[PDB]
Amino acid sequence: DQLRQEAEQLKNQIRDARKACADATLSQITNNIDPVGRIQMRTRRTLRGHLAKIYAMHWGTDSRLLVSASQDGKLIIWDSYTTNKVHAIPLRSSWVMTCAYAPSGNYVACGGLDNICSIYNLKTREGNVRVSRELAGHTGYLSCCRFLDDNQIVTSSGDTTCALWDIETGQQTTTFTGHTGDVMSLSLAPDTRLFVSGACDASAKLWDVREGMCRQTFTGHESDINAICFFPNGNAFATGSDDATCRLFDLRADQELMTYSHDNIICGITSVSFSKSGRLLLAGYDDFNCNVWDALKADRAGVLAGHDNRVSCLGVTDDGMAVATGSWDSFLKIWN
Amino acid sequence: LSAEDKAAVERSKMIDRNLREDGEKAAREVKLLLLGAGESGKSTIVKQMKGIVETHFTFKDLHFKMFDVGGQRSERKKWIHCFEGVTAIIFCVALSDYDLVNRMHESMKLFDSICNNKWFTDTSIILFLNKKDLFEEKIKKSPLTICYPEYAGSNTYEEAAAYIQCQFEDLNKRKDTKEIYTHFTCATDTKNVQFVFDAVTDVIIKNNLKDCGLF
């Protein structure tokens, strides 16, 4: 009835507590480290199969096969070394908004605008690929799918609810319900023990994959956030927003550490992914280029401009050999 | 290369050919995004013709598709960019909706947001003023002044409907790129699909001549 005032009281206490523990302002501590010079990455390969906008990609743990899901109603599994295609998985629903690749290299999970993260099977008998499951239950739209193991797939729907599924049976084992608006992006931990979901109301929450208690809740953005990725350590994670401000948060400090923003930028972020070292943070913009922000000093270190229309997905391989950007041109480059 | 990589590149070319061929056969069908306010009568027109729902109907040797997305409550501004490159936007409006509550202003404001949106700049907007009979009976009870206070004209169905039509056809800020076609749902005839056809064939001809570099 009146508990809104006590909610305000606790919110002020939180802000006071996380404020009174800030003495660094990371940009101050990083003053000593020499810059990364200037890095320019030449387009090595131009993987061109699609005939419409491509919305996702995910480097299989092989560091070779990437799966790229398009709006043509066909996700194709590329071979990043020889440009060859190995599957053309004709998906039932034309609309696709995400794509995953199970770390074993067996399963690949599509999922689009009709609420059914629908997993596929690659290493099968009979040659062709089948639909193992169709994980229905959501009442919004799938925004990302990510694989824990060949059995467990988390999802990020438009019902404001991230849900962990069980492939074996096809039912929501747990439903994480804390957010206000849409959930536009999701990212697992290198230890797969706790994931973060970037909502659509400028709140990036850290869930626990086991229980389902949102241990922390980060704020700072003014508009929608469209991309999350963990620092490969697993004690920090970027947020890509529509404010154009890719902000590096922290898991233990509980607050924002620094902000990556250039006053000549206006367009929103679509993707963020750290390099293997965690030194340089990539970010896919709507100015048809993906700037490479030094993730220690906030200074831009390069520009990867080879795209006609905006970039939608940006996947960094699991040995830092090569990044890949998925445009709306129907060509996804592989920079190095 | 090698003995295996040759067969791998052969597989690559084979599925690439199949992908391009499906591309052709997919591009052969005209797409029609179906907007409409809550209880605008999407059911009426969707049953008149034949998550997301994809309805495939054919007429006069053209394969149409309608995505009645209205059956979804989420952030519109996040998934609407999935539909740029659609031929037209079939935007049905409940014409009996002038009486209820504000609902007409709601439908008009949705039209305003969908008709001046960044992605739809070139897409010609059809709109169906459906349920004309209930509005036609209703005017004699309550005047159009209920929802349009500025309205100054005759309280006859024929002129009132024309004013409503003109009030919508005014909304578009860009007038030279996207022509707004209009029809009232002839319940006892097949002129609804016929008008959809005439609308789509017009925008196809215009696009196809602009393609030829003459226009």
């Epitope: 190995v86 | 295996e4 791998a8 052969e10 597989r11």
Partner: single-chain antibody
Amino acid sequence: DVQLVESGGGLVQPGGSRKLSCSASGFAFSSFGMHWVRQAPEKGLEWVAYISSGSGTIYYADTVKGRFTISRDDPKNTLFLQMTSLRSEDTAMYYCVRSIYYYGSSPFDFWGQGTTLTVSSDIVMTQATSSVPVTPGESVSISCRSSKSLLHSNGNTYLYWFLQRPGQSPQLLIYRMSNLASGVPDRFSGSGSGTAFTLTISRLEAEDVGVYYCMQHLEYPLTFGAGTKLEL
């Protein structure tokens, strides 16, 4: 399930003709590069013919070059072999085997039951070992020697290992000298380097005896070894 069976065997007088039809059933026939490999009554396997996906590519063994004709019918899921002017040297069983060629695939992963047809610069695989008796429970290492650097520029060595059980059709054990097949016990392992290979089978038991051919796949025509007959 996956099932390869063919028919049209019996005897033919030399200089005659036959059409052997492999009736593939239980998978997608169109996407599978199908092979034809024969076996003389008491000799090792030889490569005969080949058909790729959609008949876009064909090869032949130098022994039957232009003398045979291979052809497939996708919509019916059948593989034909038109053979003319048969010598007395083509008397053998004729297996029709599937092979799917993409990255991380398992070619030759299934072999048909096979039909007998009696009549009245290539790489050579010098499998030096012929017969070694082993007791169930021990570890034994078979040897295969190539005639050419098999570690290709790609980084992988194209050398397969087939086990033929007595009076059966031989299944795949390991592909590309290291990786295990689909549905094989983990006891089997391969190792070695360029131009020197082994199949170090561990804790051998019963229902595991037979002959082990090392089909190098690096170049065409594919050449098998003599085979090592494991006795008890």
